[PDB]
Design a protein around this ligand. Structure first.
Ligand SMILES: Cc1cnn2c1CNCC2
Ligand SMILES: Cc1cnn2c1CNCC2
Lengths: 39, 156
């Protein structure tokens, strides 16, 4: 049995930690909703 | 149950202890999550029941109590924030500049941030606090890093 619990408000936070790169990738999406890399 | 707008954890007591299987967004009385988090099953909020209303395995999205309400879109230029809600940990904002998933049907923003699978369904936001999609449907790239699409539904 699945249940939900509140975790917070949805807001933009000034001076949040900034990380992560921005890759441009060719991908395919199959009938099962799974992505795969196209090469 | 609780119907206040905001971000929620999706939990199960079927496995050992209480396990976080995902996250979701409550907005305008509709609960929004990724299909793979619930597999379309009913949810509980206290003593209240949330029944699935719309879903699609290919988009990997599902709404409860009403139709999909989130329609904001990434502008294709600006940094966004993932409001990550990891299992057993406090909600935390992470700012990033999305990359792009290029597909035969068009381009989609993507966020190169790696969190445990039970973080799936966490919202990605723009600078006005609008939900531009949900985190958790993605791929593993060449160097072994995980990258998630910014998955958004359609408001009918
Ligand atoms: C992580 C996970 C599990 N099942 N699915 C996914 C993502 N793509 C849709 C199906
Ligand atoms: C957010 C999510 C969903 N599935 N997975 C992840 C990250 N680690 C790889 C598997």
């Amino acid at each position: 049995d699945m249940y939900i619990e509140r975790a917070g408000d949805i807001t933009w936070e000034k001076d949040a930690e900034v990380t992560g790169n921005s890759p441009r990738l060719d991908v395919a999406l199959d009938e099962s909703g799974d992505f795969s890399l196209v090469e | 149950g609780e119907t206040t707008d905001g971000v929620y954890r999706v939990m199960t007591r079927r496995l050992l202890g209480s396990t976080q299987v995902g996250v979701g967004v409550m907005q305008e009385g509709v609960f929004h999550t990724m299909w793979h988090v619930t597999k379309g099953a009913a949810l509980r909020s206290g003593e209240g029941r949330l029944d699935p209303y719309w879903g699609d395995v290919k988009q990997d999205l599902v709404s409860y109590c009403g139709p999909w309400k989130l329609d904001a879109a990434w502008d294709g230029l600006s940094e966004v924030q993932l409001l990550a809600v990891p299992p057993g940990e406090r909600a935390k904002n992470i700012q990033t500049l999305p990359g792009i998933f290029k597909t035969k049907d068009g381009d989609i923003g993507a966020v190169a941030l790696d969190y445990p699978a039970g973080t799936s369904g966490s919202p990605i936001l723009d600078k006005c606090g609008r939900v531009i999609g949900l985190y958790g449907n993605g791929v593993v790239i060449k160097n072994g890093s995980y990258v998630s699409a910014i998955t958004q539904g359609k408001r009918e």
